[PDB]
């Protein structure tokens, strides 16, 4: 599953629920592998783009 | 880089415990684990310079 | 292996015997969001006390 929220002039949040056998969930888990450690998402739909950083 | 050394309270009969020099306890989450439920959280660092005063 | 310190130990016993131990390894934020609200209110009341001095 996933969810994202846009708020006017305030911080919205998003979340993703994922299987551990997914090749991207293994990449989020391995901080050894990311030399540049921050993780960012973009959700794109109908010209709108939610973007944010992993807390 | 040397080989691990142990506190002298180890070796002593009837002792159990942790000193920070030599942690031993591992909770294995692999097959036949024994743990009832778990949550592991990782939180990233979120701040590059600090501003102070007033 | 991930290593850090045991910060919280909870024990529970009932008339059906022990429920065992809840162990927190490392510094987790309170699971109930309301206990995070009380934790921030403790921080404010200490700051609000020094501002009055």
């Amino acid at each position: 599953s996933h969810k994202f929220e846009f708020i006017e002039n305030e911080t919205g949040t998003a979340s993703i629920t994922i299987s551990l056998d997914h090749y991207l969930a293994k990449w989020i888990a391995s901080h050894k592998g990311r030399a540049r450690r921050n993780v960012h998402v973009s959700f794109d739909k109908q010209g709108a783009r939610w973007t944010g950083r992993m807390d | 880089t040397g080989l691990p050394t142990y506190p002298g309270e180890y070796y002593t009969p009837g002792f159990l415990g942790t000193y920070p020099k030599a942690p031993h306890v591992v909770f294995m989450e692999s097959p036949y684990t024994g743990i009832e439920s778990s949550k592991f959280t990782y939180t990233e660092a979120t701040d590059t310079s600090f501003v102070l005063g007033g | 292996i991930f290593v850090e310190r045991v910060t919280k130990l909870t024990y529970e016993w009932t008339s059906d015997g022990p429920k065992g131990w809840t162990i927190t390894i490392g510094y987790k934020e309170p699971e109930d969001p309301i206990l995070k609200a009380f934790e921030l209110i403790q921080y404010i009341n200490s700051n609000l006390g020094q501002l009055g001095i």
Binding site: E5, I7, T13, S15 | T46, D47 | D32, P33, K36
Partner: peptide, 22 residues
């Protein structure tokens, strides 16, 4: 059931991040 209170607790924890930070 405990799980339904736990699910709603987890949603409130993700929305509280609008209002707080480390």
């Amino acid at each position: 059931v405990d799980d339904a209170i736990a699910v709603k607790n987890n949603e409130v924890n993700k929305q509280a991040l609008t209002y707080t930070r480390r």
